[PDB]
Amino acid sequence: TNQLQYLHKVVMKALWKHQFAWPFRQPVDAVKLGLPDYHKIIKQPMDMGTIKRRLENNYYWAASECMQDFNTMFTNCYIYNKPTDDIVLMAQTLEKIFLQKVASMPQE
């Protein structure tokens, strides 16, 4: 669909290459990052790599389904991390771009 094309060619394109994107390009690895409570707190992990694969593989049935996955990724970050953690500011920066681009997405 045209909305999913826009989410891939415009939204994901902008977010994937952003200088703050690197912590979000793959699933949170609780072992690598030393976060033994991560999966106790966050029950629906999400990341941009997964979203990008789903767009590439025509996994989504609706634009809002992809938008919900972006939202879950950012919301997980705000719920799990401390308010003062730098990753929170990175997520906020990327979410602002997501919303600005989504404001001009096609309607169908």
Binding site: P23, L33, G34, L35, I41, Y80, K82, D86, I87
Partner: peptide, 6 residues
């Protein structure tokens, strides 16, 4: 409330 990434 999580340990957090720093």
């Amino acid at each position: 409330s999580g340990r957090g990434k720093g």
